[PDB]
Amino acid sequence: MREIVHIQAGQCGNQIGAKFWEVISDEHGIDPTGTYHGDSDLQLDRISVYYNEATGGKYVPRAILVDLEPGTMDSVRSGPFGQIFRPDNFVFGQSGAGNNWAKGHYTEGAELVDSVLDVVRKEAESCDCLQGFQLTHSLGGGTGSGMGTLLISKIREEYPDRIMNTFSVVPSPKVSDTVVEPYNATLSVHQLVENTDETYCIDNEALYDICFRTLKLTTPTYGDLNHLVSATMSGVTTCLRFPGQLNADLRKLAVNMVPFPRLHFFMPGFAPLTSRGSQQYRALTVPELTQQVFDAKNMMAACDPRHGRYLTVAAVFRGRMSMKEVDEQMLNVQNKNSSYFVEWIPNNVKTAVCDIPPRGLKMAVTFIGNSTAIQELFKRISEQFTAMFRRKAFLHWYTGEGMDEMEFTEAESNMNDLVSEYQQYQD
Amino acid sequence: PVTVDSSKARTSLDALKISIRQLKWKEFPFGRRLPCDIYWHGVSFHDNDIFSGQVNKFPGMTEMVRKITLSRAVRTMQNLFPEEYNFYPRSWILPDEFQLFVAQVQMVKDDDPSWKPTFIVKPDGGCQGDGIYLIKDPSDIRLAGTLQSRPAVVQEYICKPLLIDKLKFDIRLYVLLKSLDPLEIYIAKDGLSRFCTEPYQEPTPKNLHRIFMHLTNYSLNIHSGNFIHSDSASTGSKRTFSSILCRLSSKGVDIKKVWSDIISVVIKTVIALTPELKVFYQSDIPTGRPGPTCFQILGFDILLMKNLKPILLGVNANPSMRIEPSLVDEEVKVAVIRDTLRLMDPLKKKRENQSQQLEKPFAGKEDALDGELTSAPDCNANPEAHLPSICLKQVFPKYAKQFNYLRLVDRMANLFIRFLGIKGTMKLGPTGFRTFIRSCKLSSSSLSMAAVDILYIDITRRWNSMTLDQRDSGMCLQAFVEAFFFLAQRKFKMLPLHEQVASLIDLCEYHLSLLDE
Ligand SMILES: CC(=O)O[C@H]1C(=O)[C@@]2(C)[C@H]([C@H](OC(=O)c3ccccc3)[C@]3(O)C[C@H](OC(=O)[C@H](O)[C@@H](NC(=O)c4ccccc4)c4ccccc4)C(C)=C1C3(C)C)[C@]1(OC(C)=O)CO[C@@H]1C[C@@H]2O
Ligand SMILES: Nc1nc2c(ncn2[C@@H]2O[C@H](COP(=O)(O)CP(=O)(O)OP(=O)(O)O)[C@@H](O)[C@H]2O)c(=O)[nH]1
Ligand SMILES: [Mg+2]
Which SUPFAM superfamilies does the record match to this protein (chain A)? Predict the structure, then answer.
């Protein structure tokens, strides 16, 4: 019951999804060969959410892996937790779309969305009662942004009732490995406004800040960042897998999280996070957990929440805790930091609680916050886009694939429209 | 010579062929690879992939002539113009409007105990009279079975029609739609009168099952033992409409007024049904892309009441053009197709332009010298001089005084495709509505963006649930009409409905003119 279809596109999406499947398979007691070796019965009671049951009690993850360059696919296959994905679930192309939004969305990636949709339909009909689709991709590339927008649109055209939550990586101001990435980012925000229900924003600058400050790690590679993203991904859908006292699913989160249809650009966080040389000098209690989750530094988006007002926040505790502590502490959060919440909506906090904690831990929290400061995360992009428009640069690589100039202006204007919408309610 | 493709003519093949031979046009019975001047399809516009030329099928007319769509358009217009659109008896769509039908019947019965109405139930997809029956009470509807999932139409039955030889008859009239922009409608001077095989009586519970005396369908009456096949145009179960009109005039009935109101109801149906055709044309043939021109022949079914008030029954996008031989059917249909083809000869416009260009006088430098006995041959023979006169009279689409205020939904239909976008998708998304609101400046302190979004969501949900298919991703044209009606109700309070909608259209047009300027 309540099955979730997973889609990965692009290099970042593929790597984050690989880490995510490794993380979940550890929690449900799945071996890298597919067999179940676990200690608790509860793990194998809702394995139908993420896994299909094949013969010989071997569980195949319900994931679809797409990209326009074959090489990355091999990287997924020849890795840990790699011979579990279905061989026919790897849909791939020949050339990796460069950094062209137009190539992925229009010319070379259009001859692959048909196969992806075929696999999507095949997976979606062997499910008892579908709950939604979740997709991991990275705005700023060619296959990620373009193929993800095309796929998302073509799926909401066919399933305009399910929940589409997207875990997307947004361009950062300091870290930047591309020169035409603002173009792709601007061309995609527009499609994410009217085709997704939840949009979790991630930037590599924030993850690097977390790995440098909170954890104090010497050489933080992409593995740690993918690990944190997998942690927050697993934490959101926990009240569908394990049992608790205040269970809240994706639709309940959306209802309590989105006051206006265009206002669904959240920002994530994961509470229990310490170094390896400090786990003994700190007590793992509910007060400490809720103090770390609302810390400005401990936020996986490069926007300062102090510059805006939280529209609404949802927290999903996992472990064995008393309701009174949770309610009292996350009421006291909104009496102290009172100026950081809007006033027209009282009780700006949603609380869920799942009994089973993550493995190796006792209590953990996943934080999802909708606040106006996310406008900055888009505002910067517009500025960059503007600087690349009046002196039209690298536009021939985009206009040579059928994209007209008017599309750029329309997408940009839609971006400022969303920014203005986020801004007006803050004042 | 004009090339005509008749590979998909079907029942219109033979009647076309002689017509093709009457115009000395040369045919492709099996088609060709190269583009053809005129393509003649029988059922669907999507029969062949046509990129240029002319096609005898407007896009989507199969769906429009369906009973529920025509009924929806008729009720929309009746809301817009009740008095004008009274020719269509009140209708309900099952199973969606069953409760409303029951409540209305109960309230009218309570108001008038002596009221004994008769209703007729017709399937949407049913043709040739199949599935059509008569009821006297809403409880008489057969609601137990697996056949009730199909949408149906319950209509007020005309219990008092005109009777000729004690037989109730209907009229099938052939109407030509030449173009949608500009609108051009032509009406044939003669039609086919189909008569019942049994004497007509007022509907009673004892004779509801008698379909022969209550249904004028040719396919149903042909199996009756009382059906008479006659070669004369004034006898038999199938006759010429001109003969019936002349018999009526023989009793002192003003046939000119009768013809005028037939023309009025035909034009009213066409205008009421046009805007969805413009939407479908934009969806299927986008502006700026190569595409063929379109026209259509429609079979209008009219029941002539004893008080000479017409009633529009069924409408058919694909009327039976088969002439088998039947003298009346041939004489009507072959002439209809011949006039149709003559009206749209691709060289007529070129010939007219050349004649107009050749008539420009060259004035200047007069100087005369003698010339002797050079007789110019009479090289101006009309190629159509041997053809009979066209019976599809050029009834003025620009009736003005007769028909100028009827263009209301058609007038505002362009607003839908203005914000449609790229690729001509059939539906309009929330961004389209919000851009429309921000463009025509309908938003204010009273109506903020949240209210607009709530209205859009509610209307879209209602119209998606209304249709048989539950997806309906987006907004159709009828939902846009409902939204425009609500917006026009909000503005210009304490004003008549005709003044409303029109005033909002004027304001929106003014704001648009400011925007482009
Ligand atoms: C010596 C010791 O105590 O090591 C612990 C540990 O508790 C620490 C170091 C862990 C450790 O995490 C990290 O050091 C880390 C570094 C970079 C990126 C991500 C993680 C740990 O890796 C993480 C790991 O946590 C889990 O097992 C959770 O279940 C977590 N990860 C996995 O299940 C998992 C499975 C397979 C492979 C890798 C991780 C999780 C939490 C929520 C939802 C899903 C998964 C644990 C107990 C440890 C180590 C091993 C050092 C921490 O784990 C998290 C992310 O909550 C980091 O801060 C917490 C708490 C501790 O300080
Ligand atoms: N947090 C992470 N960011 C990543 C990872 N891999 C790539 N990236 C970042 O994502 C951004 C986009 O690079 P990708 O090559 O993944 C984007 P895409 O696959 O859509 O591009 P093409 O394959 O060239 O079409 C860029 O800033 C990378 O540094 C990863 O594993 N984790
Ligand atoms: Mg790549």
Answer: Tubulin C-terminal domain-like (SSF55307), Tubulin nucleotide-binding domain-like (SSF52490)
